[PDB]
Swiss-Prot record, chains A, B:
Recorded topology in the membrane: Multi-pass membrane protein
Consequence of substituting residue 368 to M: In FECD4; does not interfere with post-translational processing; the mutant protein partially localizes to the cytoplasm
Subunit structure of this chain's protein: Homodimer.
Gene Ontology biological process terms in this record: bicarbonate transport; borate transport; cellular hypotonic response; cellular response to oxidative stress; fluid transport; intracellular monoatomic cation homeostasis; monoatomic anion transport; monoatomic ion homeostasis
Biological classification of the source: Eukaryota, Metazoa, Chordata, Craniata, Vertebrata
Originating species: Homo sapiens
Segments on the Extracellular side according to the record's topology features: 237-249, 286-298, 422-445, 510-539, 589-592, 638-641
The protein, known as: Solute carrier family 4 member 11
Amino acid sequence: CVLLHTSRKYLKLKNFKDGFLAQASIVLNETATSLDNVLRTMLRRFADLLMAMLFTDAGAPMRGKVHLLSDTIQGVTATVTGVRYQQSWLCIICTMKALQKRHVCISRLVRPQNWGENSCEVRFVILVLAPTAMEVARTFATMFSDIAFRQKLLETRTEEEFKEALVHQRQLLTCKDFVPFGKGIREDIARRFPLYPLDFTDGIIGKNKAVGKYITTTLFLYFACLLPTIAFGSLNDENTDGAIDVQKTIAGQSIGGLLYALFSGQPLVILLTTAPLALYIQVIRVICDDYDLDFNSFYAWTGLWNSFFLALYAFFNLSLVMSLFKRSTEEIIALFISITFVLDAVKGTVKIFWKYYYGHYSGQATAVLSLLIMLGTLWLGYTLYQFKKSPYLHPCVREILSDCALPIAVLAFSLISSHGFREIEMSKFRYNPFAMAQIQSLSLRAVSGAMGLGFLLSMLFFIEQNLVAALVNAPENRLVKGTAYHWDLLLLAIINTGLSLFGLPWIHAAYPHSPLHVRALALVEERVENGHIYDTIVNVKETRLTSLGASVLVGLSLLLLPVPLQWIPKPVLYGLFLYIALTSLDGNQLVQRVALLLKEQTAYPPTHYIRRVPQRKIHYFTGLQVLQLLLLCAFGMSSLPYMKMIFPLIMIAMIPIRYILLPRIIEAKYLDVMDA
Amino acid sequence: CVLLHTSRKYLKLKNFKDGFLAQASIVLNETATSLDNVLRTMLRRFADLLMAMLFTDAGAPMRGKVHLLSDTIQGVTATVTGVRYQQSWLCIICTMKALQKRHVCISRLVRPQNWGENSCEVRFVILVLAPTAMEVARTFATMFSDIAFRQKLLETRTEEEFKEALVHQRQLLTCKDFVPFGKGIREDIARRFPLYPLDFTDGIIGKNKAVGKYITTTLFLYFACLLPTIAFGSLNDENTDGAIDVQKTIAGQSIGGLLYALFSGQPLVILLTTAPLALYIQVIRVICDDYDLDFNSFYAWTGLWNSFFLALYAFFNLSLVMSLFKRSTEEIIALFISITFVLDAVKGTVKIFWKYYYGHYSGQATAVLSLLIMLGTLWLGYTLYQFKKSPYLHPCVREILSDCALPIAVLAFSLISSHGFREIEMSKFRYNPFAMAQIQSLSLRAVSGAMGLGFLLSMLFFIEQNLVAALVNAPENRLVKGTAYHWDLLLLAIINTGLSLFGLPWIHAAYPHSPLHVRALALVEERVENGHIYDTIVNVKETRLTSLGASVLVGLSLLLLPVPLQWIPKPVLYGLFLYIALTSLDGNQLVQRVALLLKEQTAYPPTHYIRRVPQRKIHYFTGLQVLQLLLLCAFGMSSLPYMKMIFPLIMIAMIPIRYILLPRIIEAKYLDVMDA
């Protein structure tokens, strides 16, 4: 072995408040795969024994030794996760006494190439030869450290355009809030009204064409909204004894998505039915059965009261308090939703076994095949989804696999269970081939009960919709257009009134699908941390065409319901539920901290928040979060409808708990470190 | 973000051909988890505002910035895989003008702690403060760069012992080969005879006690030899129409393992039946059925001829030519073995479906449950095995998971399929509760045929045994005791004669279990490359107690045949075959190159052999290897016994092909880079 001396030092960003800009040599579309070839081409561009000195193996270039660059500059940032390097660019420096004049070469690679640790996705290489080099390297790093400038340089097609862009960039671098009634809605409408044409003409016309990306994301959204829509329709049909069918769920989802895409601010939010909504509909069905009330009328009245409360919240600008919402409560809610998905799948398979395996109406074969198909669908979907994080696959391959993991698994296992195992008939969701509910035919006592239930549902809707909207409107997503929280809530209430009046299932912003929609509709910079791909969004196109097309396709899918879309057996839908439950915990810090018990604290990056905070306080915070999650499960997943209807109240209550009690029992600094 | 300047430079290993050795301060068993605490303790040991200067965030220690060490020294080596850092130690340097005298502090951590990017498993921290620092840091790095010296320092218990060890280490650092008949056997016996007591008294007595490690590895070996032994016994019973039972396979494996452990050199090699051996036994059964020859007599004669040829090879010292063996041929053979395992599992499940699902004697339920159990066993075993590579799990946790993955999966799914699904009876391996074969009652023509078949089997045995022995005797394993190839081959021939005379299935060195046995019986230094744990063996204990105990336990397991060990259904054994097939390709470079078509070449480390070699030549080599593998599969996996009996010949032929033809069509430099 050979000893290596690594020296790290800061460099102040150049303060612009040039000759080498014009004298720089630009290489575009470099197809070389190795560092040696790229550097040889870059050096030849100047006009060789000069490439050898660039690395540590200076003096013994023939013998096989460690081949590492000597002087490099990169962008670095500090975060709770650790030290994140800007791996999209690299600046190599070489001070050669033989040379007489400074030389600068900027090379843009066709594809991102690993160029070392913390440079796994280099696309720009800035080689600076000096006869100092420090000043030129610092100024070029300062110019290249901008996230948008790198994308602008990527968009350039010619060397002259590259130099002009560089010159242009250098020159350029040189309480009581709720008192106003309806202020938030008016502000959101004013913000997002003038941008409507823009929203509809972002990628269709202009310098950048997004037709292919728009089509691909439209297909993604259509599939990822239809398949969960079918699963939720089947679940509701099982829960409501056929009151809400799969056809009703599909129609409601299509209408709601179309209305939201057409007439909402922040169109990137996707409306879909959720597991807690199914649980609450089950609560309504149980209450109606107990009190002999018509399901349709009671459901319509509950939806009407929920929409009324949501409109009251929107008009009074309550959404602002959602700024106090922290990540811990969000992750607790997400884990509860995943647990509800898992329990729905388990209940479905248990019912299948009870009806078929135990003969409580060849049933054993059907039950075993159902279990096998559900587990296999889950496994295949999870594997195809996790292939997205592989840093060695082509970007196209690992974005198609992410895009078409669940659809591929569903199709493959539907074929397996309907053609490979056609001799074993199994369960399929009901389909009997939209009348307004008789709201007037209901007692006043039932109206008051619906009022209370709608209040609880409105709290649930407020929390969920604002959570997903905040996720979509995160600062790291780089959304130029303004936010629309109150107008979005009002439109959600309106469309929910419309859906409830016709008995269609409720819908709100979908947590798993909205960030996925944003990512599919965004340009990202690949980052490799611990052998996994992480995406840094640079530009989101922010168009309504994708959501509108997805909604229209989902609506048109009603014609494929009888003959197609029914060969998908119920176990495939349960596997879809399991896949959603597992894949909704990708960035869950609560799950990470829970697993930390089985992991090693000292194995995390030196600057990771886990290592920074004492393990005792981390465990205390995890225990408090787990206690909150257990209490949420206890109320919101019991057999008692009267106590299953209360879980929105405790969802509201956790926010005051996190805001008040936890800082009193846990130090504020540690909570700030963990949450951020 | 803040620009970072990384400077890399060589440092010549100190040439010893001291005061600071005695003046150094030693800290032992440091339980601190963060860098700040460790460095604070180390600085306090001298007797604070000095810890801040050690990192790049000098001048702004309060504001949250990137917290990286400034001057660090590490051990680095170059390999075809890439640049491998010595992550077990780190030397931090700080030149402070305030200080008046040099200071050195050596801290040993209780557990390996990530301390960087290429410092994921640091256990020794050498902090050098200077008022130069370069000389002291270089000499300490040179002393610590030794792999065995780090283990010796770990073994020390007190500061005085640590200093004495440091001082002692510093002082210390200051053709025609086959003509002799039987020379190899005599040399091996002379080498390995005096070390017998040592072999039996390595960890039992002395400074280091290995009782716990010996017990754990004995349990691992027992389970990993019994379960595949049962699977192979069932496969042979299916193939040979009950001629070779599971009881016979267990007895033969136990006797052979005991004999090999007792009276062989290099006892770390594990003898077990293999898939090609099962295929060849099937060939023998088919030939006997075709020619109406007694299976036992023909099998015994074939084994006798195979042993005679193996003894001839051992006495004439042919094993030496195995040095010409390359990694490409080894990996082709391993992939062929895995494919044979997969086809055996597929044939078993196809037969189960044909008998039960199609009723060609509730069968559909049994077939579907068989498929589900096999797939689930494969999945669980693979997951528990792959958890071994997680860099965040505790070393004990991942070591146990690797040790008890297959046994845990087998037990869990046997319980599931025998208790959870007890209503669905399914296939179980035959067991009817050891007579010498009537060799004298066989025709001369059958004797000549058995001679030819035994010649082919002897070539197969030579290749397989020498391959596994070379894997066990790899230089990187650090085996102090000498190698024994010819004596091992002679003993293998003797025990094979003994086994064949009684009709027991043949056995030779097991490729998947011998390296695993070595690893379980070895101390390793953890390395994290691309987020995966890689082990560097420092010391292998090299004892026969583990293999002897495993063989004795396997033999004693015959008493657990009737009531235990039969609830394991055949699909569990097929899942075991699949698990072995998938887990035998961990380091397969042929599989890596085949998958490279779907991967990105530029995403590999800069110094990886994949990027160094042009992709065209990599693809040509992969295509040639795949063609050889396809020919091997075609000959050794067809329905014709006369052509299924020839695959050992082409296994032999592939070595001349690799040695002669490939260098002619592919450049020698690229082949050397890829193979090494």
